[PDB]
Amino acid sequence: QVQLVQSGGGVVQPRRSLRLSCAASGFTFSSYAMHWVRQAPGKGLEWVAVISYDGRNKYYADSVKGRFTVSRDNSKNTLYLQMNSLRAEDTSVYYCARELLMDYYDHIGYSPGPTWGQGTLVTVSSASTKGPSVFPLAPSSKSTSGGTAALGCLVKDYFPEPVTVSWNSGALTSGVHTFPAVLQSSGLYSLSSVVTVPSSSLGTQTYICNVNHKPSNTKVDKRVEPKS
Amino acid sequence: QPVLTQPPSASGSPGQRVTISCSGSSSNIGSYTVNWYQQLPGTAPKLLIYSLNQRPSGVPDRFSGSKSGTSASLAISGLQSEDEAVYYCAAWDDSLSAHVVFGGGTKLTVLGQPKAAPSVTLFPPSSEELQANKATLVCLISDFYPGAVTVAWKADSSPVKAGVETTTPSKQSNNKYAASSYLSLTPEQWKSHRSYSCQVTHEGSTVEKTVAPT
């Protein structure tokens, strides 16, 4: 069958290197220009590079010029991306893709064609295991509407994923919403967990968020109450 | 031009036609052909349209492409549920620093349940965080459909862009969507304004919540 298979992705620090490969089968690789395209989590496609069939001509995205090098070995039906001088923003899934037509034309240029690999994830980060700081998100008149109050916990600055949050050791589940984490420019994650409860309980019922960050073997139990 | 311009999102009901535009310039769409790609969650993009108006085998004939001047357009006749996907246009660009240029992607929702406006909750910085010399506003956005929102923050009435981090909407278990946005301030910034607001825009309607220092 016609296919491309990327390998080589993994976790790396910035200012280091990583080498990707893409093994083609089922078509005449040596007759086609080849592309690399990348996609950051939750974001759009970004072209990285193209290499001509014979390796004589290469073009690059401006942001990787001077850092990445595309190459190929036609005898092995393999495409390579040598990613030197890695930066955090190089974090992405990297796809290889075959050029649309076998030969080059004036009104076409280059463009990714019909054959794409499955992607390999490269994660570039200088962060290291760190447990979260947990802050209460106190209920207030402003988080209260219709006999229901919202209150929560802010789970800040941890690494890596994941964190789990329960409320009252599992005794509170209805109305609990733990949101997906944001990855901050600092390289650390934060998330929030919010519960909607009857306003009636804010006096009698105690609300404790139980935060577990297994990667750092940290556990935090924090009571969340109305402000003072 | 570093990104061909596409609408961030689109929607239609089964059976409807939709069109998705892609705007560029003379050095890309004006001079070279446009391709379209379809991407489903967690899967590689698929070539949908090449050479402006041609379909690979395995692509339904309800997809078509056109171009006029420096704009290109993907039309989907007779939407079906499986057309829900992100669509990207791309073209070669022969500027200085020639390159393939992608559009930013359009998330197309094929409407399968009623429109649902987001619930928004905005929390101010806690007193514990302020004592750590930090301040985070937390804007939690849930239960919206379709799954596309934009978030804008204000200090008093003025736009704030620095220190904003917003997640990409993710499906909830009930098939509506959630997102969150965080505004980082200094304690000084937080107390030096009368209020801050998080505004969420969804299908043309805005939901704003406001908090103020204690």
Author numbering:
A (entry chain H): 1 to 52, 52A, 53 to 82, 82A, 82B, 82C, 83 to 100, 100A, ...
B (entry chain L): 1 to 9, 11 to 27, 27A, 27B, 28 to 95, 95A, 95B, 95C, ...
Provide text from the study.
The hemagglutinin (HA) protein of influenza viruses binds to sialic acid receptors on host cells and is the major target of neutralizing antibodies. In a previous study, we described five naturally occurring human mAbs that potently inhibit the 1918 H1N1 pandemic influenza virus. One notable difference between these two antibodies, however, is that mAb 1F1 not only inhibits the 1918 H1N1 virus, but also 1943 as well as select 1947 and 1977 human H1N1 viruses. A greater understanding of the basis for such broadly cross-reactive antibodies may suggest novel vaccine or therapeutic approaches to influenza virus infection. This study provides a detailed characterization of one such antibody, 1F1, and highlights common, emerging properties of cross-reactive anti-head antibodies.
